[PDB]
Each structure stands twice: as C-alpha cells, then as structure tokens.
C-alpha cells in the first residue's frame, strides 16, 4: 500500500491597493 | 625540560579585545563606537 506525501505552494504576492480615500489626504 | 612544563615570560601575552559579547565584558552593544553617525558605520571614515 502507498505512503502519504505532502506538497505546498506560495502566492505571487499580488499588489493589492487601498481603494478607499486616503486617511489624511491633502 | 618537559613539554608540559614550559611557560612564557610574565606580561608578554596580552589577550586582545572582543567586541559585542555581553554587558559584563564592558564592550557589548556597539563596542566602543558611540551612537549614530558617520564614524559608527561599516567602512565609515574620512580621508587623510
């Protein structure tokens, strides 16, 4: 019978953005 | 006259400094360079 194996993957680190207005903008 | 009975002259084998090895040694945390500045950086200094 077969033995168990694990794998893994990492993301690309997608460039998310804060789409709401700035905290203390101009 | 035995290989384990010789000894050097007194006051001839000073140890040498070792920087950054705790509080008790008196040279930990910046080992004598003071605080921030140009002279405390790696490779820092000025010309002759």
């Amino acid at each position: 019978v077969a033995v168990t194996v694990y794998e893994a993957w990492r993301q690309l680190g997608y460039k998310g953005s804060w789409w709401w207005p700035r905290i203390r903008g101009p | 006259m035995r290989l384990n009975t010789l000894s050097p002259a007194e006051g001839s084998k000073k140890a040498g400094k070792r920087l950054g090895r705790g509080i008790g040694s008196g040279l930990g945390k910046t080992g004598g360079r003071g605080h921030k500045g140009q002279k405390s950086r790696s490779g820092g200094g000025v010309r002759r």
């Binding site: 168990t4 694990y6 794998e7 893994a8 993957w9 993301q11 690309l12 997608y14 | -």
Partner: protein, 110 residues
C-alpha cells in the same frame, strides 16, 4: 490484575473522543457497554470496540470471570497529523490538519 487494549492512529480528533471517555470512567463493564450502546456519537463505536477487545483479552490470556470487572483507567492521547491544502479566494491557499488519536482502556477485577 490489569488488562490493556489500545487503538492507535484512530481517525478522530482527541477533543471529540474525550467527551465519551468520561462517561464510563469508573463504572462496571456491564453498564458501560449499554451506556455506550445508546449514545448517538461516532466515537462511541470506537470506544465500544476497544472495551470489548479489552474484556476478551482479560478473559482469555489471564483469568476468567468478567462479572466483576471495572473500568479502572481510560485516556486519549494525540497522534500524528496529516497536512493538506485548501484553496481560498483571490489566489490564496490554506493548510488543513487531519488529527488522529490513541485510545487506551484498562480493566481490572479488583
């Protein structure tokens, strides 16, 4: 005399099995069996099988007379965990654990 039966690498979390173990700690085997018979839980089946195995061991190998046996000890440990992957939204990934457990039962005429 002490008789021991164990079930290692049981497919269940230890916390869920521990809820059933304390139901029978210290009872006589005769009432422990039918206590376990009428609880609607998955772990009850496993604990019942272990208990029956312990009774059979205590009858065959060593002396007889299961009419005066008691559950002296019972406890649940943690076995190794298997690790898997579950995808989430926006390209993220998460880690899943599948926990196991070890089940031990000790019976004694005394």
């Amino acid at each position: 005399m002490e008789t021991i039966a164990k079930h290692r690498h049981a497919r269940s979390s230890a916390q869920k099995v521990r809820l059933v173990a304390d139901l029978i700690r210290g009872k006589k085997v005769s009432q422990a069996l039918d206590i376990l018979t009428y609880t609607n839980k998955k772990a009850a089946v496993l604990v019942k099988k272990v208990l029956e195995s312990a009774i059979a061991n205590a009858e065959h190998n060593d002396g007889a007379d299961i009419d005066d046996l008691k559950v002296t000890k019972i406890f649940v440990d943690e076995g190794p965990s298997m690790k898997r992957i579950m995808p989430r939204a926006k390209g993220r990934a998460d880690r899943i654990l599948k926990r196991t457990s070890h089940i031990t039962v000790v019976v004694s005429d005394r």
